[PDB]
Ligand binder design. Structure first.
Ligand code: GYP
Ligand code: GYP
Ligand code: GYP
Ligand code: GYP
Ligand code: CA
Ligand code: CA
Ligand code: CA
Ligand code: CA
Ligand code: MN
Ligand code: MN
Ligand code: MN
Ligand code: MN
Lengths: 237, 237, 237, 237
């Protein structure tokens, strides 16, 4: 099984699996049943921004999602990631559709990770920024239905030539290099991620969502994870 | 005026104004009587590192002070800086000596503040890093007894040619440009500061401390702030 | 007299002062008569980008100006800036109008300067990024007619409430802190600047241009520098 | 295949394959016979720094190698990397020993590449910084005899437990993620690399050198590349 820590932007309430009865953002620690959720006023067809931050001193994972001239939704959860994740991890973006569907377009993604060790002036850092995706983006491992390059964007799920999102799709984009997210002798370890997205549905209920995730480096899409499982979990427990 | 938020590295216990009876690190929100403290095992004559972090989503000001392969001291306090500080501030380093003394040497100092406002990708940022200070450090406002260029370092308090710290000294170094640390339409505002210091005392009785502070842009050393007031407060209330 | 090194985006050919007979970009070392110029196809009413770069190893000052889906114009000049400029300098943007006029709007500006000294891991750095300007931008010294905050933009020259650029205007925006652009013991000193602009004229010939400049820290707009002198030079020699 | 661009720090003169008869630094464009060299006063047993820079506007690859307060060696060569390299590359460090030997220790390594494309503000960037290497450095591909974690450093060639370098050794360390160093619609593409090394030889006769290189992503050490071929070339043509 993979170890997944994710920040989900869930557009479809699967009441039967623990979702709140509204679009929401949530912190998922190894289960799709979010440990904390916040009401999110998703704006169909508009470009939004999600900011995710964590540092080993506060041990608080927080995320803010906003649309220009709208209020933000923010959710935080106290978690000591050194007890949940392996030392080396891969980071990525995941999305899915099921009966209902929506485009899960990523227009930009940036990430920064820093390990500041005990003997200062011994920081290790990794930062990558994507403001354009190209047709053959060799630094991204694309899984499932994910593709790059259409209008210089990353399409996490299948969308037809005429712009229509397809149902029962699931895809993930993971950055190629392993990330050292924590290490025993660091006095401060922190990371921040930011991505802009465009979710638009034709049908009355967009589904299923987008998630920022951190996993074991060899993670792959689980069998049966389309729909409500966001291409992250094998079951809904 | 002046409004001060400071992270103090207090080496002398002034139990009459609320200090614990041991060297400590504390978060000072407009008063020398720290809102939160943590015991600090100050190592006389060794170079240590202080890391200060804050972000408006968590509204938690945290500081870590370590020495190469020694345990670190950490202190955190929940505070919404938008309700304490002006929008525009100046950041700096302060130090003082009283009847007892020590060298308050700064070997490097860096700071970073970022404001990610409402609109997709509209970020404002400021970053400066000094790993060596020159005799004519034009981008620093030196107040009191602070000098630069002695061995490529910043001396916040008076030291004599022979390397001996003087009593009743106070000095502060402020970065020249005003900093926008908060703004009403920012989705996320955050800052990080790091500095390495060397506190050395001829006898085993150092006083008074070093402090990283954020103040109104027009701040100047208050009268009588040597000693226990760290060059920061006018009184001990 | 001030010492000015500038990269001009000149929209009006003042043939009588040495300009080429077309819009052009040029490297100005202490004189408005550019040491090198390149033909520039200015696109009225479109947002463009200028990138300026220099490093002490190559001692080449280069600038590229482009508009999306258009060819860029680039100009380079070999100059050892340590022999032209003071060690400490202020950097800014300047613009002017004369009989003919245009808006000289800056939508974003970012700058990075680094001094890497001999004993490595002793780099000094300064970076600031502005993607939004506010009504009271305290970290910018505005000179002449320059104002900030209209649509979160920096207007270097006067433009009426109804959006009309005015003639005989000149204004400059300089970053507040002095910049150390070179120093005797650095093994590498480099800087890069980037700004996006929107120049639109109602009249048949926009004038006069925008310039990125580096000057002595106390520089002020010279008397008679509106029009063709870009608010940078006292005469046209 | 393989296509190699490298900056070599050559400590042993192989006058038969074109080396000057002194230790030198050189720019190698697909051949060990450097296109340009500069004399290097290699200081046995001291830690030195190498800085490599390149930007597509000037199309000039420059390198500076210095030692604390000693004169630096500089070498520059005009080359359009878009005509030599694939779009996607891997960057790494290489070293070898032959009949004579030395330690080829890397103490820190950082790299930064940025692509500023046509559209206002659409920049892609990659930055990694290693100031300490762990035994399990998962984001580095180690080829040959290179190992990490010995004292927090990268040993590119074989050293014995007692600190003695071995002959006929070759090893390379490549950053895990492919790097986009050039792209057809980029207005500006640039990269900077810095690394600190320590070359120590038991006798006063070190060989063979260390080299920073950029290659096709699938590059592996060529057969017989120990010694003078620096683990980079198959032959000496
Ligand atoms: C009706 O159920 C189907 O569609 C929804 C919405 O798309 C998914 O959440 C769910 O997994 C799938 O089984
Ligand atoms: C005994 O007092 C004096 O010396 C101590 C230590 O320097 C200071 O804290 C104090 O303000 C000053 O009055
Ligand atoms: C016709 O001349 C006037 O207008 C032009 C264009 O605006 C300026 O360059 C010049 O300085 C001013 O004297
Ligand atoms: C005399 O030769 C041997 O040793 C030298 C120095 O190590 C290498 O350059 C060379 O390739 C190898 O053949
Ligand atoms: Ca759901
Ligand atoms: Ca005290
Ligand atoms: Ca002109
Ligand atoms: Ca050789
Ligand atoms: Mn959910
Ligand atoms: Mn105290
Ligand atoms: Mn001109
Ligand atoms: Mn050679």
């Amino acid at each position: 099984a993979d170890t997944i820590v994710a920040v989900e932007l869930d557009t479809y309430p699967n009441t039967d699996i623990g979702d709140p009865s509204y679009p929401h953002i949530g912190i998922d620690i190894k289960s799709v049943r979010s440990k904390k959720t916040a009401k999110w006023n998703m704006q169909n067809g508009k470009v939004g921004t999600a900011h995710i931050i964590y540092n080993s001193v506060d041990k608080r994972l927080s995320a803010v999602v906003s649309y220009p001239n709208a209020d933000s939704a923010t959710v935080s959860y106290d978690v000591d990631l050194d007890n949940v994740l392996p030392e080396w991890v891969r980071v990525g973006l995941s999305a899915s559709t099921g009966l209902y569907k929506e485009t899960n377009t990523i227009l930009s993604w940036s990430f920064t990770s820093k390990l500041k060790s005990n003997s200062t002036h011994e920081t290790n850092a990794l930062h990558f920024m994507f403001n354009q995706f190209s047709k053959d983006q060799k630094d991204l491992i694309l899984q499932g239905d994910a593709t790059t390059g259409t209008d210089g964007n990353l399409e996490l799920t299948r969308v037809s030539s005429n712009g229509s999102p397809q149902g029962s799709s699931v895809g993930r984009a993971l950055f190629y290099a392993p990330v050292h997210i924590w290490e025993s002798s660091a006095v401060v370890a922190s990371f921040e991620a930011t991505f802009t997205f465009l979710i638009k549905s034709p049908d009355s209920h967009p589904a299923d969502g987008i998630a920022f995730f951190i996993s074991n480096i060899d993670s792959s899409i689980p069998s049966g994870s389309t729909g409500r499982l966001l291409g992250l979990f094998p079951d809904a427990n």
